[PDB]
Amino acid sequence: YDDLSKQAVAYRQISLLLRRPPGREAYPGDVFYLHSRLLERAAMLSPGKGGGSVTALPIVETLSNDVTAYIVTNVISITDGQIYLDTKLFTGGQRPAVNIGLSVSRVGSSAQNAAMKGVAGKLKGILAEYRKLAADQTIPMIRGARFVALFNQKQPSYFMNAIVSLYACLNGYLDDVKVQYVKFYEYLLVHRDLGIMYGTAKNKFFYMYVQELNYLIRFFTLNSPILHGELEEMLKQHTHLFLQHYQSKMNAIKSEKDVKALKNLLYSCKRAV
Amino acid sequence: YDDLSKQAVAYRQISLLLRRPPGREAYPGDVFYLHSRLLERAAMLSPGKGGGSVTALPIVETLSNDVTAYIVTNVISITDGQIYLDTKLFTGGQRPAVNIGLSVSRVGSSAQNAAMKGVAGKLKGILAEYRKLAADVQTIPMIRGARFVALFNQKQPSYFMNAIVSLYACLNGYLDDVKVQYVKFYEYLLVHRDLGIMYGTAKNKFFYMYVQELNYLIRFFTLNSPILHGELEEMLKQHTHLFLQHYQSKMNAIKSEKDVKALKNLLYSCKRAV
Amino acid sequence: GKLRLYKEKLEGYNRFYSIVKTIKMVTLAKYRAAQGRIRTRDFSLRYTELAFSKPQAAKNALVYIPITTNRGSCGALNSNIVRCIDSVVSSKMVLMPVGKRGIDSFSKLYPDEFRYGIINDMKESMHFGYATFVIENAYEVSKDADRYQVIFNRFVSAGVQRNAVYNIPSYEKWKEDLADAASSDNQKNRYLFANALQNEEEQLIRDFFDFHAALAVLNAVGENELSEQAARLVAVEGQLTNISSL
Amino acid sequence: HDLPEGFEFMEHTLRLTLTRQDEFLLREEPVKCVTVTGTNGEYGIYPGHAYKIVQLNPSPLTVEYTDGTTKKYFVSGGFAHINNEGSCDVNTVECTLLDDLDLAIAEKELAAQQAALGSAKDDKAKSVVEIRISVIEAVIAALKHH
Amino acid sequence: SSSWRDHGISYLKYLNVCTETLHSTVKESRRAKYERWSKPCYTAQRPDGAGGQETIDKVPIHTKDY
Amino acid sequence: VAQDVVQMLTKYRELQDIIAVLGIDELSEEDKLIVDRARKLVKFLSQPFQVAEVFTGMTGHYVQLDDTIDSFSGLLMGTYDQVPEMAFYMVGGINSVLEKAKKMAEEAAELEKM
Amino acid sequence: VAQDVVQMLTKYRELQDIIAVLGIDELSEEDKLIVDRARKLVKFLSQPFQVAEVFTGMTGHYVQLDDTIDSFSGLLMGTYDQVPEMAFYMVGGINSVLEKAKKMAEEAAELEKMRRARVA
Amino acid sequence: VAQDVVQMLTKYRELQDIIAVLGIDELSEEDKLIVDRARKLVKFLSQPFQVAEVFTGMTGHYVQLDDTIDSFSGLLMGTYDQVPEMAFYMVGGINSVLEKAKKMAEEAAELEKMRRAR
């Protein structure tokens, strides 16, 4: 629903024009009831009635980051948490500008995939310590900063391409890699592949070009005897070759028309995950 | 009246339900008049009509220390000053949590007893200098001022004799050598017990703390008076010297488990009984 | 909602003013103690000038001893000394700053040249012992050198903190300049000074060097302390006016 | 453009300038004589045309003004810088007035440090204690009689 | 035993021992004023690891360590 | 014991405004020790709930009334000053604090050796 | 280039609240260089309009899209760090900035020579 | 005259902040004389009220407009520099100031003669 703010204004017009008594911010008494009966019809049915679902993504516009408005506060109290988009994070660089501290999912853990639950449980511990230590370099400080660089993206990522690039940062494959070159590291992981490029490949099944592994990962997870050893090869080959062959250029290139060429390369890497 | 805030809400319900035009915070026009005619009936009558009285203690709840609310601001403008109770002082330790800077009595001096007026006139000068110097090296005002703050903590109300003597001690500086944490233990041993009579250096002819009937003699003559001045200053000199020598000597000693805890539980119970 | 938060914002600034006013008033007491000096001063380092006063203007280790503040909020003072270090910076260079800000700032900006730094908690006054501790650490791990420069903050006026320096050449280079001054019409200001000094024995000439070097440092740190409290007075009273305008 | 050195802001019968740490006790005060002690005995400084540097031991000064009055000090160390013109600058580290020192506390402190000499750490640390006694003996001596 | 010069210890350390002795002989009434021009209250150090200063320990600081 | 937790936390909120303005090093010797205890009091007040195993990712803790009073009493005394701060975060009683502190000592010993 | 101007100005508004509380000298070494550039970005965003010749008292400036992108790009790189701040205030593209900076250098040279004339 | 009182009191509040920081001796020669006059201006602005005889314990003073302007004018000129400060405190008009200053001179002469003996 894009968006419930403009629905409420339309309902207020109807109510006021028909002489319904207005209350807070000139809205009628039942403007809460308007959004409540809408959003409650969205649900997850039982096994006894098919097990179908209607997931709801209501959008609600706030004026200058003011959550205390009547229509905004109503919809927050109905929904199962929110995804808050901060204006300062948008202009700052982070896109999508998801304020993780303000945002929340009330049924998060049970909703996730078995593979996604493995990596994400640790990320809450790392970003909690990173945010605290940023206010007041540890391993959490290094790895925490790379997650923030990885969260920037224009178009949506495929489940395989996302979880592997997060798993790399979790176990600490992007520690020696600098913060500005994380998107170039992630691009070369997904579309290209360095093991098959140079020479030192020799993986029997696990590669990134094979998109069909997506559904095997969802079943077994990355932390599992089937895929763990094969995955950690792929990442070891990718890091060592990226640090040796690709990251060596950045110590070199300190001239006009090469620093600009480095920028235009890295800026385009933010878009494609 | 506990409390006028909930009375106003009840009167607002009545007024709104009967279509009386509402104004500020939805209250009717005459919500000031409601509390005004109530509180003005409380008064001190003349000698010509018995000289009787009705003293009023209206309570008014504030929301997050906001005095700018309509019902709170109305009652302040009617009453003869207030006793402000701060939330930070309550949680901080001071109970009752009386914010002396915010609080005020518009007819204070004339209302007090002759004895209580003597000690209290000085306390305003000491606490004024203590509060200023606390914001901005210990002076005499800084020492004696801090002891008053420790003395003001109490659960149940103090008797007039037991209060004024413990304040008079702090005024003339009998609790200067006594530390701040042991003021309630010093005050407890003054009121209920007595160290001079506790086999030795007593020899007072009349003035003791066990004799509660002296209360009304103090109210007549005051402490600063030729009848009681010399006799009182003996009682306090005996109490301080013996407390510092025999009772406060333990604090240099007690640095062990099951004695430090025993000292705490003793001192915490002394906050309750004045 | 808005009535409560704007009050709590205002209550925040009230606590801010009170705490910053405590720094203001405490530094006045230190400034009153510190100004017990301006009436004296200067005449103590009369013959220190004849030893070390260079006219103007890198082969074997140039030591630098910049005298910085402990805690910040002094203003254009630590930044002023950083500009002097950034302006000179030769190939042969080594830094031994004095103050917690110097330790923190020079360690990150110059990891190659920075050896270590000295800290004084400002509990007692700036004394000879502190100045000897500076001079003796200036050649300990840093060892011998061509000269030991001492960048510091001169205090001429309450508003004007001047940025000044003392140059201490090494004893081998110093004795050669002294010998020139003793037996030539060149120098002139120290013709009979060098003759009177060189007539005395060799330990006396070496102890004269050590003494006036520590005395030159003693002035620098004490002058910096006076500049420190004055500049902080202007910055803190500037902070108060910023808090009051908010 | 370049840094002005620290000496640029300082400006400038006998007339001495007796200082301590970084502050004068006397500033170019007219005087008949002053009597230091160090290295080559007690060379009394008088009006002259000599120019001479004199290192100081732990010893007293005695500032005798032209009129007759006397003001005695006690020094820890430093130098005495005599000029061609009738003036010197006695730059000390510490220059206490011979009055601020105590006879009873000094003799008590002598007895204390002699005990430390016997049970010293080593021959390096024991020499430092002898410096401390060498001052105390000179402190007590300057008080008594002279 | 005797020679402070021959067991290391520069002229400047001797002066500090001489002043600190001269301050310890000051009268009871006015010793606080003189002790603040001598009493050691400084150290030399550098930051290493993460907010953990080393403390160098080379120039003695205190009188008895000379 | 309960009043001392409320008293200490009230002092801590006043000290928190001073550290923001001046600094952590500017505080007194006794006040620094109050901050170390008060920081641990705020952390020890947290508790992993048994219904919230999905959220916290850790098993729940039913803390007994006798355990609650004794553990907080000892923290106010200063018996657990040498115990680290993050040991107190998201645990039950004192046995779970000392258990987590043992795990922190062992893992810190391994990472230091490597 | 346009995003970097928006990013830099977002950092600058956060730093502007710190300078008001603490002070200009309290900021870090890298953050001071961001302020010097960001202050120039705010000044360079100003422009004398051709209709507003009566108000500004200066001729207008039509700034080309290629000029706008290149001049702002170089300012973010730090190619114009040595260029003074008031050169960027109320001008068009980079040629007018360097023209005003030349006029500022010449007028500052003349006023300095006036105070250098007297000696002793 | 009225503007000069307001001007002098404005300078005095600025000088009061300097004395707290630096000291009374640190001020200039002319600024010391401004403080002596400004301190007297603050004291001379006080007045014992006729209704408040019970409170003050002294008789009231109706000060005429011509008296008010002339007395304050002379104080700004510096005609009453040798007059002591506490003479100006709680009086009305220049005749009462000089009357109290005469009483202060006589009582100070007596107390000084007592200590020039014991």
UniProtKB/Swiss-Prot annotation, chain A:
GO function terms (MF aspect): ADP binding; ATP binding; proton-transporting ATP synthase activity, rotational mechanism
Compartments where located: Mitochondrion; Mitochondrion inner membrane
Outcome of gene disruption: RNAi-mediated knockdown of the protein in procyclic, insect stage cells impairs assembly of the F(1) component and slows the proliferation rate of procyclic cells that are cultivated in vitro, both in the presence and in the absence of glucose in the growth medium. ATP synthesis by oxidative phosphorylation is dramatically reduced in procyclic cells.
Residues given in the record as ATP binding sites: 153
Keyword Nucleotide-binding: yes
Top-level lineage group: Eukaryota
Keywords linked to the UniProt accession: ATP synthesis, ATP-binding, CF(1), Hydrogen ion transport, Ion transport, Membrane, Mitochondrion, Mitochondrion inner membrane, Nucleotide-binding, Transit peptide, Transport
Any one cellular-component term (Gene Ontology): proton-transporting ATP synthase complex
Coiled coil: none
Site annotation Required for activity: residues: 103
UniProt subunit comment: F-type ATPases have 2 components, F(1) - the catalytic core - and F(o) - the membrane proton channel. F(1) has five subunits: alpha(3), beta(3), gamma(1), delta(1), epsilon(1), plus the additional subunit P18 (Tb427.05.1710) that is not present in F(1)F(o) ATP synthase from metazoa. Subunit P18 (Tb927.5.1710) interacts with the alpha subunit with a 1:1 stoichiometry; the interaction is direct. Subunit gamma is part of the central stalk. F(o) has three main subunits: a, b and c.
Family indicated by similarity: Belongs to the ATPase alpha/beta chains family.
From Swiss-Prot, chain B:
Disruption phenotype: RNAi-mediated knockdown of the protein in procyclic, insect stage cells impairs assembly of the F(1) component and slows the proliferation rate of procyclic cells that are cultivated in vitro, both in the presence and in the absence of glucose in the growth medium. ATP synthesis by oxidative phosphorylation is dramatically reduced in procyclic cells.
Annotated localization: Mitochondrion; Mitochondrion inner membrane
Source organism superkingdom: Eukaryota
Disulfide bond annotation, renumbered to this chain: none
Record site: Required for activity: 103
Binding site for ATP: 154
Coiled-coil boundaries: none
Family of this protein: Belongs to the ATPase alpha/beta chains family.
Function: Mitochondrial membrane ATP synthase (F(1)F(o) ATP synthase) produces ATP from ADP in the presence of a proton gradient across the membrane which is generated by electron transport complexes of the respiratory chain. F-type ATPases consist of two structural domains, F(1) - containing the extramembraneous catalytic core, and F(o) - containing the membrane proton channel, linked together by a central stalk and a peripheral stalk. During catalysis, ATP synthesis in the catalytic domain of F(1) is coupled via a rotary mechanism of the central stalk subunits to proton translocation.
Name of the protein: ATP synthase subunit alpha, mitochondrial
Organism whose genome encodes this protein: Trypanosoma brucei brucei
Taxonomic lineage: Eukaryota, Discoba, Euglenozoa, Kinetoplastea, Metakinetoplastina
Swiss-Prot record, chain C:
Localization terms from the record: Mitochondrion; Mitochondrion inner membrane
Keyword RNA-binding: no
Name this polypeptide is given: ATP synthase subunit gamma, mitochondrial
Organism this protein belongs to: Trypanosoma brucei brucei
Main location: mitochondrion
GO molecular function, one term: proton-transporting ATP synthase activity, rotational mechanism
General function of this protein: Mitochondrial membrane ATP synthase (F(1)F(o) ATP synthase) produces ATP from ADP in the presence of a proton gradient across the membrane which is generated by electron transport complexes of the respiratory chain. F-type ATPases consist of two structural domains, F(1) - containing the extramembraneous catalytic core, and F(o) - containing the membrane proton channel, linked together by a central stalk and a peripheral stalk. During catalysis, ATP synthesis in the catalytic domain of F(1) is coupled via a rotary mechanism of the central stalk subunits to proton translocation.
Keyword Hydrolase in record: yes
One cellular-component annotation, GO: mitochondrial inner membrane
Membership in a protein family: Belongs to the ATPase gamma chain family.
Topology of this chain in the membrane: Peripheral membrane protein
Keywords: ATP synthesis, CF(1), Hydrogen ion transport, Hydrolase, Ion transport, Membrane, Mitochondrion, Mitochondrion inner membrane, Transport
From Swiss-Prot, chain G:
Subcellular location, record wording: Mitochondrion; Mitochondrion inner membrane
Subunit structure: F-type ATPases have 2 components, F(1) - the catalytic core - and F(o) - the membrane proton channel. F(1) has five subunits: alpha(3), beta(3), gamma(1), delta(1), epsilon(1), plus the additional subunit P18 (Tb427.05.1710) that is not present in F(1)F(o) ATP synthase from metazoa. Subunit P18 (Tb927.5.1710) interacts with the alpha subunit with a 1:1 stoichiometry; the interaction is direct. Subunit gamma is part of the central stalk. F(o) has three main subunits: a, b and c.
Family as reported in the entry's similarity comment: Belongs to the ATPase alpha/beta chains family.
Descriptive protein name: ATP synthase subunit beta, mitochondrial
Function: Mitochondrial membrane ATP synthase (F(1)F(o) ATP synthase) produces ATP from ADP in the presence of a proton gradient across the membrane which is generated by electron transport complexes of the respiratory chain. F-type ATPases consist of two structural domains, F(1) - containing the extramembraneous catalytic core, and F(o) - containing the membrane proton channel, linked together by a central stalk and a peripheral stalk. During catalysis, ATP synthesis in the catalytic domain of F(1) is coupled via a rotary mechanism of the central stalk subunits to proton translocation.
Species this chain originates from: Trypanosoma brucei brucei
First-to-last residue of the parent protein present: 396 to 515 of 519
